[PDB]
Amino acid sequence: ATTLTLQQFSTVYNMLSFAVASMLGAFAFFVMGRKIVGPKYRLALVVSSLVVLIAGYHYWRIMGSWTAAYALKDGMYVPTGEPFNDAYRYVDWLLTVPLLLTELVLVMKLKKESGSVLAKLILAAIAMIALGYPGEISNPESQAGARLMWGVLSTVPFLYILYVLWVRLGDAIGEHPAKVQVLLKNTRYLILLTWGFYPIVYAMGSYGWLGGAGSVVAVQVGYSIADVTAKALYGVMIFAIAYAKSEADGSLPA
Amino acid sequence: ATTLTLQQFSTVYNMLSFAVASMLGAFAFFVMGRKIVGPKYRLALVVSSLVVLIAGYHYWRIMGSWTAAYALKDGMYVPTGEPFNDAYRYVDWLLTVPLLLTELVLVMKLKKESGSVLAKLILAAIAMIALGYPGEISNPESQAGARLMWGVLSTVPFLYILYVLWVRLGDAIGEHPAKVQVLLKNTRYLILLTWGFYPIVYAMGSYGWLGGAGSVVAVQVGYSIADVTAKALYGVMIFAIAYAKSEADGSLPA
Amino acid sequence: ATTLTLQQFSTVYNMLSFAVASMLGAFAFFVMGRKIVGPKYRLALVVSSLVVLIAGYHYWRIMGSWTAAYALKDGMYVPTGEPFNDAYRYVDWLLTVPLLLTELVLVMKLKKESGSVLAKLILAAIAMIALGYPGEISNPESQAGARLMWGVLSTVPFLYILYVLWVRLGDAIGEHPAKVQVLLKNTRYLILLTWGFYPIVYAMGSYGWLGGAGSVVAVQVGYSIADVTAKALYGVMIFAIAYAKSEADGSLPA
Amino acid sequence: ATTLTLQQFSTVYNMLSFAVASMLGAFAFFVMGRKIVGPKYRLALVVSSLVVLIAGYHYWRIMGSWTAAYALKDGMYVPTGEPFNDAYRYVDWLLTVPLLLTELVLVMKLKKESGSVLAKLILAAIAMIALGYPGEISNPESQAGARLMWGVLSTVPFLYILYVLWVRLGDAIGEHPAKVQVLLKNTRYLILLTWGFYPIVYAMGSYGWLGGAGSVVAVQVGYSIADVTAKALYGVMIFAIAYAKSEADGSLPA
Amino acid sequence: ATTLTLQQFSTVYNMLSFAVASMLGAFAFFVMGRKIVGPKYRLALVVSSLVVLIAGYHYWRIMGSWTAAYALKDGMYVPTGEPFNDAYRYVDWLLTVPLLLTELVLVMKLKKESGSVLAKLILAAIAMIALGYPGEISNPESQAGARLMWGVLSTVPFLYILYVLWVRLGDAIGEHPAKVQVLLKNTRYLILLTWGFYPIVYAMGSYGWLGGAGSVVAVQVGYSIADVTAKALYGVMIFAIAYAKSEADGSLPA
Ligand SMILES: CC1=C(/C=C/C(C)=C/C=C/C(C)=C/C=C/C=C(C)/C=C/C=C(C)/C=C/C2=C(C)C[C@H](O)CC2(C)C)C(C)(C)C[C@H](O)C1
Ligand SMILES: CC1=C(/C=C/C(C)=C/C=C/C(C)=C/C=C/C=C(C)/C=C/C=C(C)/C=C/C2=C(C)C[C@H](O)CC2(C)C)C(C)(C)C[C@H](O)C1
Ligand SMILES: CC1=C(/C=C/C(C)=C/C=C/C(C)=C/C=C/C=C(C)/C=C/C=C(C)/C=C/C2=C(C)C[C@H](O)CC2(C)C)C(C)(C)C[C@H](O)C1
Ligand SMILES: CC1=C(/C=C/C(C)=C/C=C/C(C)=C/C=C/C=C(C)/C=C/C=C(C)/C=C/C2=C(C)C[C@H](O)CC2(C)C)C(C)(C)C[C@H](O)C1
Ligand SMILES: CC1=C(/C=C/C(C)=C/C=C/C(C)=C/C=C/C=C(C)/C=C/C=C(C)/C=C/C2=C(C)C[C@H](O)CC2(C)C)C(C)(C)C[C@H](O)C1
Ligand SMILES: *C/C=C(C)/C=C/C=C(C)/C=C/C1=C(C)CCCC1(C)C
Ligand SMILES: *C/C=C(C)/C=C/C=C(C)/C=C/C1=C(C)CCCC1(C)C
Ligand SMILES: *C/C=C(C)/C=C/C=C(C)/C=C/C1=C(C)CCCC1(C)C
Ligand SMILES: *C/C=C(C)/C=C/C=C(C)/C=C/C1=C(C)CCCC1(C)C
Ligand SMILES: *C/C=C(C)/C=C/C=C(C)/C=C/C1=C(C)CCCC1(C)C
Secondary structure, three states: OOOEOHHHHHHHHHHHHHHHHHHHHHHHHHHHHHHHOOOOOHHHHHHHHHHHHHHHHHHHHHHHHHHHHEEEEOOEEEEOOOOOOOHHHHHHHHHHHHHHHHHHHHHHOOOOOHHHHHHHHHHHHHHHHHHHHHHHOOOOOOOHHHHHHHHHHHHHHHHHHHHHHHHHHHHHHOOOOHHHHHHHHHHHHHHHHHHOHHHHHHHHHHOOOOOOHHHHHHHHHHHHHHHHHHHHHHHHHHHHHHHHHHHHHOOOOO | OOOEOHHHHHHHHHHHHHHHHHHHHHHHHHHHHHHHOOOOOHHHHHHHHHHHHHHHHHHHHHHHHHHHHEEEEOOEEEEOOOOOOOHHHHHHHHHHHHHHHHHHHHHHOOOOOHHHHHHHHHHHHHHHHHHHHHHHOOOOOOOHHHHHHHHHHHHHHHHHHHHHHHHHHHHHHOOOOHHHHHHHHHHHHHHHHHHOHHHHHHHHHHOOOOOOHHHHHHHHHHHHHHHHHHHHHHHHHHHHHHHHHHHHHOOOOO | OOOEOHHHHHHHHHHHHHHHHHHHHHHHHHHHHHHHOOOOOHHHHHHHHHHHHHHHHHHHHHHHHHHHHEEEEOOEEEEOOOOOOOHHHHHHHHHHHHHHHHHHHHHHOOOOOHHHHHHHHHHHHHHHHHHHHHHHOOOOOOOHHHHHHHHHHHHHHHHHHHHHHHHHHHHHHOOOOHHHHHHHHHHHHHHHHHHOHHHHHHHHHHOOOOOOHHHHHHHHHHHHHHHHHHHHHHHHHHHHHHHHHHHHHOOOOO | OOOEOHHHHHHHHHHHHHHHHHHHHHHHHHHHHHHHOOOOOHHHHHHHHHHHHHHHHHHHHHHHHHHHHEEEEOOEEEEOOOOOOOHHHHHHHHHHHHHHHHHHHHHHOOOOOHHHHHHHHHHHHHHHHHHHHHHHOOOOOOOHHHHHHHHHHHHHHHHHHHHHHHHHHHHHHOOOOHHHHHHHHHHHHHHHHHHOHHHHHHHHHHOOOOOOHHHHHHHHHHHHHHHHHHHHHHHHHHHHHHHHHHHHHOOOOO | OOOEOHHHHHHHHHHHHHHHHHHHHHHHHHHHHHHHOOOOOHHHHHHHHHHHHHHHHHHHHHHHHHHHHEEEEOOEEEEOOOOOOOHHHHHHHHHHHHHHHHHHHHHHOOOOOHHHHHHHHHHHHHHHHHHHHHHHOOOOOOOHHHHHHHHHHHHHHHHHHHHHHHHHHHHHHOOOOHHHHHHHHHHHHHHHHHHOHHHHHHHHHHOOOOOOHHHHHHHHHHHHHHHHHHHHHHHHHHHHHHHHHHHHHOOOOO
């Protein structure tokens, strides 16, 4: 593998520590702020906490992996041979991606067919991660065909999730007040922006653009930014929607 | 022992980390969602949390064992001589298996003879694990007779547990509304499917089919899947039954 | 010291891990089930949690000691020279034994002289452990006289505790309903059975019967069984008595 | 790097441990004292806890770094070559500085334009830390120009934050009773005093005054004092303002 | 430094572990028993928890230091050269000593000038520890003058604290019922007895009486006993006073 300078290793280490601290803070906030909203939305906040808890644990492992993957030697960071690859992140995703959609459904309080919509979204998310995993461990050079096939098969449930978010949930969003509608539309925009990061990284790794110390650093920093935005800030938006709906129906504990 | 490739070791490590994260998330969810159901069912949820807490600790140990059982050497994972065997899992089972049945009884609110049914189930579960343990540490080649005898003796309380689940608890299940009856029958199906995994693994290890890196990987992955399904998803079903019964009697805090 | 086989070391390690998991589960259960009983008994449950918390920490240390006391070498476990002896357990006992009696008094709600009875029991327990400690560190061969003297002096407060349990607390037990009387008598029987284990181990170590790998394994397994029964199951019985008394006076939150 | 005497290393280690203990105590206090004030201010206290939680984690890392940066050798502490620099602290600041201002807004209960003021302050704080980071990793000798430019660009949002604190928030402060006005003015004075420490350290590092064991020790001790005062004591003042306002409107739970 | 026998090292290690377990148990008890007293006294209990939490963390460090300060070699414990001295304890004291007095004021509910009395006591405690620290790191042989001067300057605020405890707080104590007066006087006696331990150890270290393995062991055991009595048992007395005052005014939740 490529050698890293002190600054490159430090940048990746700092961004991983930032992700760990963000998940710990988000967990504390969701647990304690569950009591601030009406009792009807607390379940949704519970799920938010689970997400930032799981990712938190996983990031604590990833950080430990990163330190173990390099050794300091003559003012350079030289790979030790201990593995460090994105495949481990899939273990996080298979739990967090289905839970994320779950909280969005829970806070929405769908009047009809809530169970069927939630079940189909959870199945789509699980299938997306499960089909993505075999392509990720495929070597982009020796096994390009397998990587392309698995990525294309993984994109189908991703498109189904986007369709359900923008087409089915439109009519449910339209039944909320203006404040709640703005918050829900902003939450949907935050999914689209953050979730496309992962397929783009997969595609760049398929075309062999991720070689080099620069690319290695950028991908880890992008993972930390994307995970924090898609989990902690996403849960904060869920909390904001729950608080607004509690204020609308007069169920706010304050 | 057999040497592992990078992918085989990574697969086992990732599945163990997945089990740890699943137990931690389940624990947080049961603790926080205890307040979402009526006060009559909270004790049941408490027991659910205990299960996912205990298994969680144990999986954190198993993961640590797995890393200690192999060393990276010339792009292969070579056994270090530190032990790694299924016997340690029995220490988990002796607590979790009696507790699992316990929560199913607690959420059911048996009108008569609840204590006697629960006591007999707990004794059956303890006896099953206690008789299974001597056969597991029996060498399948030198001590085949002892392994067969202990497995057969362990299966008797297993059959008694299945009989009590399907024959005694039928009349109690029939006294619930349709939603609760569907949830209880699905919970019983989830026990039968997940619990048979363990005796099948024991029997395959008795016939010498578990040699080889492939079998080693498959058994650990199957253990992680079976444990997560039989503890975290099982507790989620217990939570669903408690929520449905709270909604039926008008005791839902919301 | 004697060398251990793989199975002997594994058995001791598994029993220590079992004790750790049991104390962690008991702690979670007592903390969460405090809200299930009436407010008059919650203090008693609090003390229960403290016991299983303290022992839990101590067992986490003992486990760490055991691994450090032996090294794997030619398929045998050879002592490293790092100490491992029962004296460390006394540090646990000096806190847990006075607290155990405390919870039994607290749940009992003595009408008169509760303070004096509790104070005398706490002083007796402290004196018992404090007089036992100098005899334990006495070499059974070179310092037999000192060991005998300290054990005999330690037994006097033990007999006083048994006398107070069976003679003073008889009249208080007789003032409870039949269910509560059965639970209290069973709790008293559980003390007598579990508490005699420790003096028997001390006496066997005084007569030089504890040499050999078999004896070493048996004593650690017996310590784990006795501690779990005398702390976690004892607290569960305290919880059962509190729940029964809450149901009797109509103070049950459910 | 310069060698440290035993006393210099010990002083830095003790001050880091002090910061860790202070953040842990502050976290426990804010979590438990949230229930002591009226429900209208609890959200503010929640944010306080998040701050002392995040910094706590980060200080636990910094302490671990410091021990790793030196080795004991011939009664002197000699640098090992493992890095130890202030850049890691920026990862803490980017979360804590926006949250600190947040709690001050939350406890204040701005009647109009609360959202816009809070958003502008959060953006200013993020920009301040983000522009400060490139100058900190700039070598003060080889890259003086870049360090000066980044520091000057970082000071603009700092001045905007001070202006908003003293000019916009004046009219809001004037609408509180005398006790609350005194507490708010003291809180504003505590920001000005503690926050200027960081730019002064940056400027001293730009002029090359931070060489030498004395300067190294003083800067770490100053960081610990400044962080504890600006986070734990600042949150205690937030708690005092919340308690005073709860007492003023008769919402105190006691 | 002096070599230790197995028993001397074991005694110090066991007493440090005892202090850790005592602080953890005290923390759990204060957190859970806060709900058992009236809402007017809960803040006081919160502060109690903070004390036993901080000391707990610090003792976990001290224990780790002690193990690191010696190595097992030929059945003796030989110093490794890693430092172990009392100066680190001052980092604990500077937080815990001001908090201890704080809880005593908080539970007392001073009718007039509570703020001024508490502020003066906190300032006196901080000054006492801050003036003690420079004398502790003074070598008792080469720097006897500095040690004497710093100790004498540290004793002045100690005498002021004792004067405030016995002279100002007399009239406030006289306004409580007989039970509360007895508890307050016993709490004052527990301060005087436990707090004089520290200056006596300082004075003995000034006269060179602390050399030798015996003295080394005795001082650590005395520190553990004094800290446990002055923090955990002191908080238990605070809890007893709060419970008695809750029972007196009819604010007991039970
Ligand atoms: C191509 C390819 C693949 C797959 C690639 C994939 C799936 C890529 C996915 C990329 C996506 C979905 C990117 C999405 C980006 C969306 C953007 C940038 C959306 C922008 C929206 C904004 C900024 C809206 C702004 C706002 C508006 C308009 C209204 C609001 O009120 C306020 C505000 C939020 C500012 C594989 C995986 C099959 C492998 C193969 O080898 C290559
Ligand atoms: C043989 C042997 C041994 C023991 C082996 C043992 C005990 C094996 C145990 C295996 C068992 C009990 C397997 C059980 C499998 C059960 C299955 C596959 C059940 C399937 C049920 C389904 C899929 C139901 C589906 C559903 C239905 C029908 C209705 C619901 O509403 C909806 C839905 C859940 C889809 C030893 C231990 C003595 C050692 C010896 O050397 C060898
Ligand atoms: C002799 C000796 C020493 C000391 C030894 C000591 C103190 C030994 C202590 C042993 C004791 C106290 C043993 C106690 C055993 C008690 C038993 C086995 C009690 C049995 C009770 C049962 C099983 C009751 C059963 C039940 C009944 C009867 C009614 C209930 O409703 C239902 C049920 C629980 C089943 C030293 C320490 C001085 C050193 C010296 O060198 C040697
Ligand atoms: C110059 C320079 C830079 C930047 C430096 C900067 C931004 C320095 C910042 C320093 C600041 C803002 C210092 C502020 C100090 C403020 C003080 C000391 C305020 C004192 C207030 C007190 C003590 C008030 C006392 C009170 C009063 C008056 C009323 C209250 O009721 C009671 C009490 C609190 C006692 C860079 C970053 C561009 C790099 C370049 O190379 C050099
Ligand atoms: C001398 C010296 C220094 C300083 C030394 C210092 C400050 C020493 C301090 C020692 C102190 C203050 C010791 C205090 C001891 C107090 C005792 C023993 C109090 C006893 C009270 C009891 C036992 C009361 C008992 C009770 C009574 C009377 C009524 C209650 O209702 C029930 C009960 C608690 C039993 C330095 C630091 C300047 C350095 C220099 O080189 C040497
Ligand atoms: C918190 C973590 C999140 C939101 C992770 C999201 C991950 C994805 C949306 C992954 C998508 C993929 C595809 C659409 C196809 C290529 C393979 C994947 C798994 C990278
Ligand atoms: C969470 C863990 C669970 C549910 C473990 C379940 C384990 C069993 C059902 C084990 C059964 C066995 C037999 C029926 C006979 C052979 C020996 C055993 C112990 C593997
Ligand atoms: C949870 C731990 C428990 C209940 C420990 C109990 C320990 C004893 C009852 C010890 C008793 C002893 C004697 C009666 C005399 C000999 C010395 C002792 C300390 C082993
Ligand atoms: C708890 C941590 C706190 C409050 C950190 C505050 C940090 C600053 C106010 C930093 C300010 C800076 C400038 C004004 C310019 C030079 C660069 C900075 C980042 C040191
Ligand atoms: C929990 C820890 C406690 C109560 C520590 C108390 C410490 C003291 C009272 C220290 C007193 C000292 C003097 C009076 C003069 C000599 C220097 C000191 C710091 C040892």
